[PDB]
Amino acid sequence: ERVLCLFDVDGTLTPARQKIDPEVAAFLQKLRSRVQIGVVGGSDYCKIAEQLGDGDEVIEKFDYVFAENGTVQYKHGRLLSKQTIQNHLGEELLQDLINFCLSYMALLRLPKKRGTFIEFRNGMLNISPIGRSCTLEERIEFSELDKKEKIREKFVEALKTEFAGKGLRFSRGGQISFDVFPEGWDKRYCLDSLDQDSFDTIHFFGNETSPGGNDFEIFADPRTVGHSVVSPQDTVQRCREIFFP
Amino acid sequence: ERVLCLFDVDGTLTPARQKIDPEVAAFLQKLRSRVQIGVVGGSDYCKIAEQLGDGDEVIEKFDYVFAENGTVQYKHGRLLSKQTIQNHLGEELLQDLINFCLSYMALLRLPKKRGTFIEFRNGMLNISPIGRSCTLEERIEFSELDKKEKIREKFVEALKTEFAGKGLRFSRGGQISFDVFPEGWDKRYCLDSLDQDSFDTIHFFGNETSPGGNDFEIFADPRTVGHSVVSPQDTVQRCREIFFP
Ligand SMILES: [Mg+2]
Ligand SMILES: [Mg+2]
Ligand SMILES: [Mg+2]
Ligand SMILES: [Mg+2]
């Protein structure tokens, strides 16, 4: 009867990369009268906060905010966190990765390039092979080129092969980029800390719980009761069925 | 009798990369009763604003704020600006530059690396060969390694040679990085817009007016009355001598 509902963000509580519907927001606070509620996303904290409230309201609206798959953690209004990838991987492997990426991208000759090809985050390296778009027009242009030439896809194939067996994982940063993160640093990462918070049950909700999806591992983990949803309205209905029948 | 005093920031009005002394700030507003006053820096606007006031006060405290050597311009409280390097250089040369940098850095094997090796700004590309430090400790560590191995210095020599005659310039980003910018996009850039604002005299003050220094060109330009200073106290004294004798 100490219960947590933990939600993926994009596609689960909000439209992808966009603001939460106020009616969903309002339900979550109603759900909060029965259970603790938390979010876990691949995005950084700034992005997640932006989608879920104004300023830093998200840490007040939710009992847990797990950004970068849980490598960044807010707990009951306070920053508990955090871990760094360089600490976990070690400098040698990290630099092997980086120099392989640098060398690969140097040989890519595209219509055009921008900057910040490799960004250090807490939970991952975000790799943007064409560079980060400066406008929406460039972002769309880059997306289309990536689809036609399979830029990110082919880069990841080369990376996975080069680092076979060395414990690196690769996932989409949506369009434009992909993340590189240590094995185990998918959404499951947040479960290790949650393990110590004495929940009787942890319900996880996500919209990519199929194999390949960025919710799969946390959905499938024996530490959670898993729920697959297709939309924020689906999520709200499932919560009503389980907690307010 | 329409006069502008235009100041470099770092070392001229403030300690390098640091906040302005309130007593200097106070004098500048007194000087403002006689002349218009402006700043021009290599840094981005956020950095300059941070050194000269709280929030966006700098655009209120100064009649002109020229960031990134004038490629970004605030004029009497409003953003007038701005120009982009990609527009000026063209995509082909830009990508030649970028891929040369990527390829060069890929072959650098250091004690360690971080991220954001190439950052797109308005007035330049900021190149950080070891990556951007995550802490003060890493920043100092990187500075020392750069001094011993001449990392930035040797990278610039290779770059200048490769792009000989093609109109690129290179200058220090302090420690850790160097800027690449188009010929003419040093501090003089801001003079072109100022040319149209009907000043009878434009007095420029800087602390790197010697050849090699990032104030040299604007100091030497026939559009300004040039002044060399060594400290923010030197600057204030010179203004007192010229305007309040
Ligand atoms: Mg999702
Ligand atoms: Mg489960
Ligand atoms: Mg200076
Ligand atoms: Mg002059």
UniProtKB/Swiss-Prot annotation, chains A, B:
<keyword id="KW-0413">Isomerase</keyword>
<dbReference type="InterPro" id="IPR005002">
    <property type="entry name" value="PMM"/>
</dbReference>
<feature type="binding site">
    <location>
        <position position="17"/>
    </location>
    <ligand>
        <name>alpha-D-mannose 1-phosphate</name>
    </ligand>
</feature>
<dbReference type="InterPro" id="IPR023214">
    <property type="entry name" value="HAD_sf"/>
</dbReference>
<keyword id="KW-0479">Metal-binding</keyword>
<feature type="binding site">
    <location>
        <position position="121"/>
    </location>
    <ligand>
        <name>alpha-D-mannose 1-phosphate</name>
    </ligand>
</feature>
<feature type="binding site">
    <location>
        <position position="177"/>
    </location>
    <ligand>
        <name>alpha-D-mannose 1-phosphate</name>
    </ligand>
</feature>
<dbReference type="GO" id="GO:0043025">
    <property type="term" value="C:neuronal cell body"/>
</dbReference>
<dbReference type="GO" id="GO:0005829">
    <property type="term" value="C:cytosol"/>
</dbReference>
<feature type="active site" description="Proton donor/acceptor">
    <location>
        <position position="10"/>
    </location>
</feature>
<feature type="binding site">
    <location>
        <position position="139"/>
    </location>
    <ligand>
        <name>alpha-D-mannose 1-phosphate</name>
    </ligand>
</feature>
<comment type="pathway">
    <text>Nucleotide-sugar biosynthesis; GDP-alpha-D-mannose biosynthesis; alpha-D-mannose 1-phosphate from D-fructose 6-phosphate: step 2/2.</text>
</comment>
<feature type="modified residue" description="Phosphoserine">
    <location>
        <position position="231"/>
    </location>
</feature>
<comment type="similarity">
    <text>Belongs to the eukaryotic PMM family.</text>
</comment>
<dbReference type="GO" id="GO:0006487">
    <property type="term" value="P:protein N-linked glycosylation"/>
</dbReference>
<dbReference type="Pfam" id="PF03332">
    <property type="entry name" value="PMM"/>
</dbReference>
<keyword id="KW-0963">Cytoplasm</keyword>
<feature type="binding site">
    <location>
        <position position="10"/>
    </location>
    <ligand>
        <name>Mg(2+) 1</name>
    </ligand>
</feature>
<dbReference type="InterPro" id="IPR036412">
    <property type="entry name" value="HAD-like_sf"/>
</dbReference>
<feature type="binding site">
    <location>
        <position position="8"/>
    </location>
    <ligand>
        <name>Mg(2+) 1</name>
    </ligand>
</feature>
<dbReference type="GO" id="GO:0006013">
    <property type="term" value="P:mannose metabolic process"/>
</dbReference>
<feature type="binding site">
    <location>
        <position position="207"/>
    </location>
    <ligand>
        <name>Mg(2+) 1</name>
    </ligand>
</feature>
<feature type="binding site">
    <location>
        <position position="224"/>
    </location>
    <ligand>
        <name>Mg(2+) 2</name>
    </ligand>
</feature>
<dbReference type="GO" id="GO:1990830">
    <property type="term" value="P:cellular response to leukemia inhibitory factor"/>
</dbReference>
<comment type="function">
    <text>Involved in the synthesis of the GDP-mannose and dolichol-phosphate-mannose required for a number of critical mannosyl transfer reactions. In addition, may be responsible for the degradation of glucose-1,6-bisphosphate in ischemic brain.</text>
</comment>
<feature type="binding site">
    <location>
        <position position="219"/>
    </location>
    <ligand>
        <name>Mg(2+) 2</name>
    </ligand>
</feature>
<feature type="binding site">
    <location>
        <position position="221"/>
    </location>
    <ligand>
        <name>Mg(2+) 2</name>
    </ligand>
</feature>
<keyword id="KW-0460">Magnesium</keyword>
<keyword id="KW-0597">Phosphoprotein</keyword>
<feature type="binding site">
    <location>
        <position position="132"/>
    </location>
    <ligand>
        <name>alpha-D-mannose 1-phosphate</name>
    </ligand>
</feature>
<keyword id="KW-0007">Acetylation</keyword>
<dbReference type="GO" id="GO:0009298">
    <property type="term" value="P:GDP-mannose biosynthetic process"/>
</dbReference>
<dbReference type="GO" id="GO:0004615">
    <property type="term" value="F:phosphomannomutase activity"/>
</dbReference>
<feature type="binding site">
    <location>
        <position position="179"/>
    </location>
    <ligand>
        <name>alpha-D-mannose 1-phosphate</name>
    </ligand>
</feature>
<dbReference type="InterPro" id="IPR006379">
    <property type="entry name" value="HAD-SF_hydro_IIB"/>
</dbReference>
<feature type="active site" description="Nucleophile">
    <location>
        <position position="8"/>
    </location>
</feature>
<protein>
    <recommendedName>
        <fullName>Phosphomannomutase 1</fullName>
        <ecNumber>5.4.2.8</ecNumber>
    </recommendedName>
</protein>
<feature type="binding site">
    <location>
        <position position="175"/>
    </location>
    <ligand>
        <name>alpha-D-mannose 1-phosphate</name>
    </ligand>
</feature>
<comment type="subunit">
    <text>Homodimer.</text>
</comment>
<dbReference type="InterPro" id="IPR043169">
    <property type="entry name" value="PMM_cap"/>
</dbReference>
<dbReference type="GO" id="GO:0046872">
    <property type="term" value="F:metal ion binding"/>
</dbReference>
